[PDB]
Design an enzyme around this catalytic site. Structure first.
Site, short mmCIF file in Angstrom:
data_model
loop_
_atom_site.label_atom_id
_atom_site.label_comp_id
_atom_site.label_asym_id
_atom_site.label_seq_id
_atom_site.Cartn_x
_atom_site.Cartn_y
_atom_site.Cartn_z
N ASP C 50 -58.61 47.81 30.88
CA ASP C 50 -57.65 48.33 31.86
C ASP C 50 -57.61 47.47 33.13
O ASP C 50 -58.61 47.37 33.85
CB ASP C 50 -57.99 49.78 32.23
CG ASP C 50 -57.27 50.24 33.50
OD1 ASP C 50 -57.86 50.11 34.60
OD2 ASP C 50 -56.11 50.70 33.38
N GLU C 129 -59.87 18.27 46.63
CA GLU C 129 -61.06 18.00 47.44
C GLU C 129 -61.32 19.28 48.20
O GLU C 129 -60.93 19.44 49.36
CB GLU C 129 -60.78 16.86 48.42
CG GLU C 129 -60.46 15.59 47.68
CD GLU C 129 -59.75 14.55 48.51
OE1 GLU C 129 -59.78 13.41 48.04
OE2 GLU C 129 -59.16 14.85 49.56
N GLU C 131 -63.40 21.62 50.28
CA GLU C 131 -64.48 21.63 51.27
C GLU C 131 -65.06 23.05 51.48
O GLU C 131 -64.47 24.05 51.08
CB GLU C 131 -63.97 21.02 52.60
CG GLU C 131 -63.84 19.47 52.60
CD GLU C 131 -62.96 18.87 53.74
OE1 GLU C 131 -62.94 17.60 53.92
OE2 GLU C 131 -62.26 19.69 54.41
N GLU C 212 -70.14 16.98 55.69
CA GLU C 212 -68.77 16.88 56.15
C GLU C 212 -68.72 17.15 57.66
O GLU C 212 -69.58 17.84 58.18
CB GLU C 212 -67.91 17.82 55.28
CG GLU C 212 -66.49 18.10 55.74
CD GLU C 212 -65.54 16.92 55.65
OE1 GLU C 212 -65.60 16.17 54.66
OE2 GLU C 212 -64.72 16.75 56.59
N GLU C 220 -69.00 18.88 51.09
CA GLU C 220 -67.96 18.67 50.09
C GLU C 220 -68.58 17.95 48.91
O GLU C 220 -69.51 17.14 49.07
CB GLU C 220 -66.77 17.82 50.64
CG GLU C 220 -65.53 17.65 49.65
CD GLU C 220 -64.44 16.67 50.14
OE1 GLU C 220 -64.00 16.72 51.33
OE2 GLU C 220 -64.01 15.81 49.33
N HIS C 269 -57.42 19.20 49.87
CA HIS C 269 -56.36 18.21 49.67
C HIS C 269 -56.08 18.10 48.18
O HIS C 269 -57.00 18.20 47.35
CB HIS C 269 -56.79 16.83 50.18
CG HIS C 269 -57.32 16.83 51.58
ND1 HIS C 269 -58.11 15.81 52.07
CD2 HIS C 269 -57.21 17.74 52.58
CE1 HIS C 269 -58.47 16.11 53.31
NE2 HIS C 269 -57.94 17.27 53.64
N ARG C 339 -52.23 9.17 59.53
CA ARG C 339 -52.88 10.35 59.00
C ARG C 339 -52.56 11.64 59.75
O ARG C 339 -53.34 12.60 59.75
CB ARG C 339 -54.39 10.09 58.80
CG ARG C 339 -54.67 9.07 57.65
CD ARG C 339 -56.14 8.57 57.55
NE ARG C 339 -56.45 7.43 58.43
CZ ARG C 339 -57.13 6.34 58.05
NH1 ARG C 339 -57.56 6.20 56.80
NH2 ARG C 339 -57.37 5.38 58.93
N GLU C 357 -51.27 12.50 47.80
CA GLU C 357 -52.25 13.48 48.26
C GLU C 357 -51.59 14.40 49.24
O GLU C 357 -51.17 13.98 50.33
CB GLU C 357 -53.47 12.82 48.94
CG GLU C 357 -54.40 13.82 49.68
CD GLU C 357 -55.59 13.19 50.44
OE1 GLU C 357 -55.36 12.45 51.41
OE2 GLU C 357 -56.76 13.48 50.11
N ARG C 359 -52.22 17.05 51.63
CA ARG C 359 -53.35 17.52 52.38
C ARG C 359 -53.32 18.96 52.91
O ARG C 359 -54.38 19.48 53.21
CB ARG C 359 -53.58 16.57 53.52
CG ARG C 359 -54.56 17.10 54.53
CD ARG C 359 -54.89 15.98 55.51
NE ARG C 359 -55.33 14.77 54.81
CZ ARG C 359 -56.51 14.23 55.08
NH1 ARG C 359 -57.29 14.81 55.98
NH2 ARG C 359 -56.91 13.13 54.47
N1 LIG Z 1 -53.59 10.03 38.75
C1 LIG Z 1 -54.69 9.85 39.23
N2 LIG Z 1 -55.37 8.71 38.98
C2 LIG Z 1 -56.59 8.54 39.53
N3 LIG Z 1 -57.29 9.41 40.34
C3 LIG Z 1 -56.56 10.60 40.59
C4 LIG Z 1 -55.24 10.86 40.05
N4 LIG Z 1 -54.71 12.08 40.41
C5 LIG Z 1 -55.69 12.57 41.17
N5 LIG Z 1 -56.90 11.77 41.38
C6 LIG Z 1 -58.24 12.25 42.31
O1 LIG Z 1 -58.56 11.61 43.64
C7 LIG Z 1 -59.82 12.39 44.04
C8 LIG Z 1 -61.02 11.69 44.59
O2 LIG Z 1 -61.37 10.97 45.76
P1 LIG Z 1 -61.87 11.23 47.30
O3 LIG Z 1 -62.98 10.18 47.44
O4 LIG Z 1 -62.47 12.65 47.48
O5 LIG Z 1 -60.56 10.94 48.40
P2 LIG Z 1 -60.10 11.32 50.01
O6 LIG Z 1 -60.70 10.12 50.82
O7 LIG Z 1 -58.66 11.54 50.20
O8 LIG Z 1 -61.01 12.70 50.42
C9 LIG Z 1 -60.36 12.87 42.77
O9 LIG Z 1 -60.10 14.29 42.74
C10 LIG Z 1 -59.62 11.93 41.80
O10 LIG Z 1 -59.97 12.24 40.47
C1 LIG Z 2 -60.17 14.04 54.47
P1 LIG Z 2 -61.28 14.70 55.65
O1 LIG Z 2 -62.64 14.57 55.13
O2 LIG Z 2 -61.19 13.76 56.87
C2 LIG Z 2 -61.09 16.38 56.20
C3 LIG Z 2 -59.98 17.41 56.01
C4 LIG Z 2 -60.18 18.68 56.82
N1 LIG Z 2 -61.54 19.16 56.59
C5 LIG Z 2 -59.16 19.77 56.44
O3 LIG Z 2 -59.23 20.84 57.07
O4 LIG Z 2 -58.23 19.53 55.67
MN LIG Z 3 -58.73 13.73 51.08
MN LIG Z 4 -63.37 15.59 52.85
#
Ligand SMILES: Nc1ncnc2c1ncn2[C@@H]1O[C@H](COP(=O)(O)OP(=O)(O)O)[C@@H](O)[C@H]1O
Ligand SMILES: CP(=O)(O)CC[C@H](N)C(=O)O
Ligand SMILES: [Mn+2]
Ligand SMILES: [Mn+2]
Ligand SMILES: Nc1ncnc2c1ncn2[C@@H]1O[C@H](COP(=O)(O)OP(=O)(O)O)[C@@H](O)[C@H]1O
Ligand SMILES: Nc1ncnc2c1ncn2[C@@H]1O[C@H](COP(=O)(O)OP(=O)(O)O)[C@@H](O)[C@H]1O
Ligand SMILES: CP(=O)(O)CC[C@H](N)C(=O)O
Ligand SMILES: CP(=O)(O)CC[C@H](N)C(=O)O
Ligand SMILES: [Mn+2]
Ligand SMILES: [Mn+2]
Ligand SMILES: [Mn+2]
Ligand SMILES: [Mn+2]
Lengths: 468, 468, 468
Positions: C50, C129, C131, C212, C220, C269, C339, C357, C359
């Site tokens: 349910d 990503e 956090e 972070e 993160e 993000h 950014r 991305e 964000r």
């Molecule tokens: N098409 C794609 N090809 C390669 N990586 C991708 C793709 N789509 C999404 N990603 C993702 O990008 C993310 C990782 O990197 P990250 O170091 O955390 O970047 P940022 O500096 O923006 O926080 C992962 O979740 C990665 O797998």
């Molecule tokens: C990519 P980054 O590590 O500089 C941080 C993003 C921020 N925490 C949020 O609130 O989006």
């Molecule tokens: Mn990011």
């Molecule tokens: Mn981050």
């Protein structure tokens, strides 16, 4: 009373003179001068002072303004230890001397002038019902690691369980319980009665006093109406007397609109009517004994509501009150019956007492600004023959969405009320009453206050979202 | 006393006027007006006020009622700091002005009118014995995680063991011990004597005072009877004086029927008799010196008992008292001897003092409503010659089930008493005294109170069922 | 893996099976079944349950739904004491069995189907990503008399002053200090590393971990992308592993967006890109190596932003994060450089890794719903060739109002984001992915949450308005 005042100094062996005036937000300010500093020219040219460190008068360059004593406003302070005389002042522009654009009191006077100027009427009448609470202890704060607020009063229903030094005597008002129980449930006869005596000694006229709906010391003191500007004066005196008598009884008073949640918020309903040569222009043969005039006023008020909100509901908290179920009307309608309507028409025997009551204003409102906005929207409704439509004689809070009634309503938030006043600013600038920067400055101030609340995490968010 | 009152303002340099009236549940309400607000028309047209935020007068649309001062009721408040005059008011319908359907005081008056109208008698006499307790500390509360109540008084037998700041002086009334010990066992001579002095200063006539059966400060002050309506007035004054004098002595008084369990509950026995041209219609040559009349009254009371219960026992707690062993009669019978009977016939020398005493009523009862119900059931017993049967001259509480005696008894619960008043509502509507919605509103209020108790887990349930 | 699962039960001497699925708000739910209850038909017809007592699935009349195990999702729970196997389930309609309108997972799958159906691409790629913060103690509450929140962690900068049992060892991250200091400033290597190991054991692929920006334990863990639906699954696993490993280390984790004020909020993000037969449809010769396709996606996302907000920023708190200065972009623009833009284009060597991305999404978002909304707005931007305009290569947060730049921005509040999704609901209903009541139900839920925050007084209001 240039003359009157001088006699009054010798009559009370006055030692000081307290110059008071009102800031943009509405907070009354003061400055003390020895009685000997009061002379002939003091009255015709006032005294010098820097407004720079005042909310929105800023101008750490040009705003060196004049305090212009108003001989009529003179009255003894009943709380001060050394005999001091209070004198309400106007903020005038240096040299020019005709009245600061941002001085709320000047603005209120401007609006009263414009009333006689349009020949529509010769005097505006205001009768506000400013409610408040009396607590014993209030604590709050915000830091990076958290925030909080804690209210406490002997009357607080939550204390039914609380252990006390000399035992818990348990006669407390329940939630919404606080209406008219006889003492001891009502711990405040003696207190209110003092506020009354005092208020009268300070020129106000008390029609009555009583406890009020909410637990934890909500109370109200009803005072007799007066010419719009003199009334906003009386409001400041009111709050002072309240705040201080409370203080002196070891209590702490607050005029904030919605301190507690779950308990009928404190509000300041506004009774109004216009007159011309001793005749009440608001009486007639239309709805409830009203004149045509009144209904146009109503139409105006209803039209400019959201903008008026920014003045009569200047706080984010103000909007926590404006919700169904707590005697706070949100519906922009009028009626003599239905009390779901923000404008209520008091039914009354003679025509001499016919008027309207705009219920949405709260305490936090700058009397002067709030009143003016009400008046100016009323005048604009008259000039432009704005029809208020048909009166609401239907059902109360949520019976309506049967046809999902979406009739006009007061601003939902503060940002809204503000932005509305931004746009619909036209009716205020009329007669040069409100000026653009006077209005742009106000919006700016409130915008930063709204920022704080909008940006600081709310406790409830944790309750709702921590485990997300 | 329109005239009398005016003189009385100058005579006591009265500063305020306290308007008091009584709500549906029975709680006395008040509102203060400056003495200057008292003028000529104030007396003929009263003052305006919104009843909406009052128990069961609700009508957040139409209930804008009139407070009608009763010049006769005027008397100084002995507790208030600033000299104030109290004036009992009637709640009248706006415009029509003849008396609100739900105003308990109007209802009581209606019933008194109907008495003279049926020509049965010209005045009803009520003499109630309202008992109460005096504690030092009372705490209680209910939340989701639990609930509780804690009583404490210096007299509480449980304190024989308790450690005190300056030593335990140990002279306390044992369970049911509280009857007539001389001080110091009886910590309250001086207190009761004040309540007496005061009550008299406020117009009541004190016949006597004494401690009462239960430990922990049970006390009673006997006051002289009066015309039904004036008496219910006096009751409110009584409770006020009691509640407040108690407060002022650092004590806390309660008129709730059964605060503690295991200790003779507080009750309000009702002595009654009817008169016509100075003659006591209740004296005759039948049982105990009674007239035929009286026995029909008794028959009526007994017939409508459960319905009357709803007025004279309006609380769930009321039913915690109505049990054997604690001088609380449940048996709907009459007798001059047997005190297991809820109606007792006081034996007395002359005929001038012949009457009946209906013992089941308790303090919590709305005087006005309760009295009326008693009167109306009495009248109905007379009109319809309802025979009360034979008097009970047998044994006390549980000797009876020898033939499992099931003679008539008072309502077992509140739901019962209510539902009974629902059905057997006919005798009340007579003479247009009680109206249907007046009665339907009352039932509604009490129904929600009963809900709370019926729905909230009781501590004892854990004792009894947790380990289930 | 119907077969695979059976072998896996014997392989781990599994005692229980934990059925998990996700509710509307996004909270993962579970139910346990003994391994023996797992048989042949269990897989083809699921189990009965349910949904009535679940957020917005309500239907205390018809909503008796089916839990449909997904043989592929099977994996051991690493925290439970007795060996138990977890199996993600889908909520199917009874009898019909094709997938509940409100089951977020079904909705996500629907959206993935519609992608292949429009032939635009054959797989969607998501890389979030997410956090979070790690505290030691979290307290909060709201009652009539007040409300509060209190955060505390060993890392909290405020503790530099705090006295500790065995002495204060003082190596703490300052405000925004929390980025990459080496331990001991970073108290959490060992913790994150566990979350990593575990996450991998549970099928996820960890690319990295790090502390972070914010003080008080913001951290993160970066995980490798995957097909949209499998990724939202992984998100739930992520949060679980995080929440629980934290718990087991005597810490408490929260994915709420803006716990503290004054310290770079936690966000999620979203990296995305579309594919077709192993080729990355997002690479081309336009801006930053992007394909035409990508820019239409971007245009769509930007067009439907406010509506998408309601899914990817479902909390009032979400909006406390979306402000300048804390690495939270509000500007609805794209760029590889600047950014200040909510859509950022990661610059990268090959074309194999080209993507976008977005964000603005935060943690609180229901993965499934949030992802779908992103995808569907992307598809709509493609079908309707919505041009994203020119990239933002200008200045960061408040350099803009030089021409008072008012380019498109994310929803300012939640009410807004909601109302937007109300109207702009069209692109979601496409392909029968989102249904009206599925959407109307969501709006309803969030509306009541928003009510709470909007109606409960905020601590800061006292700071700002008590002395009004
Ligand atoms: N098409 C794609 N090809 C390669 N990586 C991708 C793709 N789509 C999404 N990603 C993702 O990008 C993310 C990782 O990197 P990250 O170091 O955390 O970047 P940022 O500096 O923006 O926080 C992962 O979740 C990665 O797998
Ligand atoms: C990519 P980054 O590590 O500089 C941080 C993003 C921020 N925490 C949020 O609130 O989006
Ligand atoms: Mn990011
Ligand atoms: Mn981050
Ligand atoms: N024109 C007018 N004529 C008479 N009274 C007026 C007029 N305009 C305003 N009033 C005001 O009505 C207010 C008082 O009554 P109150 O008992 O507090 O009413 P409510 O029941 O709406 O709270 C006073 O402020 C009174 O002076
Ligand atoms: N008709 C009547 N004639 C004389 N006294 C009456 C009459 N009706 C009621 N009474 C009341 O009897 C009550 C007082 O006596 P009390 O000593 O308290 O008796 P009990 O022993 O039953 O508690 C008073 O309220 C008295 O005035
Ligand atoms: C006229 P009333 O006493 O019923 C109360 C108004 C309410 N407190 C408010 O918030 O405006
Ligand atoms: C006449 P009494 O003093 O013996 C007592 C009556 C008892 N308190 C009640 O609950 O009625
Ligand atoms: Mn009021
Ligand atoms: Mn009012
Ligand atoms: Mn007695
Ligand atoms: Mn008795």
């Amino acid at each position: 009373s240039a003359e009157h005042v001088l006699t009054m100094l010798n009559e009370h062996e006055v030692k000081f003179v307290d110059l008071r005036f009102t800031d943009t937000k509405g907070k009354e300010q003061h400055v003390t001068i020895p009685a000997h500093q009061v002379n002939a020219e003091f009255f015709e040219e006032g005294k010098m002072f820097d407004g720079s460190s005042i909310g929105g008068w800023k101008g750490i360059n040009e705003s060196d303004m004049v305090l212009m004593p108003d001989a009529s406003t003179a009255v003894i302070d009943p709380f001060f230890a050394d005999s001091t005389l209070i004198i309400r002042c106007d903020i005038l522009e240096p040299g020019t001397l005709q009245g600061y654009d941002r001085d709320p009191r000047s603005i209120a006077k401007r609006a009263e002038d414009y009333l006689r100027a349009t020949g529509i009427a010769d005097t505006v009448l205001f009768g506000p019902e400013p409610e408040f609470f009396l607590f014993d202890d209030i604590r709050f704060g915000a830091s990076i690691s958290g925030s909080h607020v804690a209210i406490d009063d002997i009357e607080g229903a939550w204390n039914s369980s609380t252990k006390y030094e000399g035992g818990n005597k348990g006669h407390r008002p329940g939630v919404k319980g606080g209406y008219f129980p006889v003492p001891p449930v009502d711990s405040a006869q003696d207190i209110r009665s003092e506020m009354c005596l005092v208020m009268e000694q300070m020129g106000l006229v008390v029609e009555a006093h009583h406890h009020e709906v909410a637990t934890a010391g909500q109370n109200e003191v009803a005072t007799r109406f007066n010419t719009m500007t003199k009334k906003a004066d009386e409001i400041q005196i009111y709050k002072y007397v309240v705040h201080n008598v409370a203080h002196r009884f070891g209590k702490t008073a607050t005029f904030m609109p919605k301190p507690m949640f779950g308990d009928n918020g404190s509000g300041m309903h506004c009774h109004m009517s216009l007159a011309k040569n001793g005749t009440n222009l608001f009486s007639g043969d239309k709805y409830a004994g009203l004149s045509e005039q009144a209904l146009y006023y109503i139409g105006g008020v209803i039209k400019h509501a959201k903008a008026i909100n920014a003045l009569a509901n200047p706080t984010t908290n103000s909007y926590k009150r404006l919700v169904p179920g707590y005697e706070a009307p949100v519906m922009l309608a009028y009626s003599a019956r239905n009390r779901s309507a923000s404008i209520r028409i008091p039914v009354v025997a003679s025509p001499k007492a016919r008027r309207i009551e705009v219920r949405f204003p709260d305490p936090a409102a700058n009397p002067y600004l709030c009143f003016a906005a009400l008046l100016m929207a009323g005048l604009d409704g008259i000039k432009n023959k704005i029809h208020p439509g048909e009166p609401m004689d239907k059902n109360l809070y949520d019976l309506p969405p049967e046809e999902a009634k979406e009739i006009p309503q007061v601003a939902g938030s503060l940002e809204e009320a503000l932005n509305a006043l931004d746009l619909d600013r036209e009716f205020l600038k009329a007669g040069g009453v409100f000026t653009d920067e006077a209005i742009d400055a106000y919006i700016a101030l409130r915008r930063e206050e709204d920022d704080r609340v909008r940006m600081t995490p709310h406790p409830v968010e944790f309750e709702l979202y921590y485990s997300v």
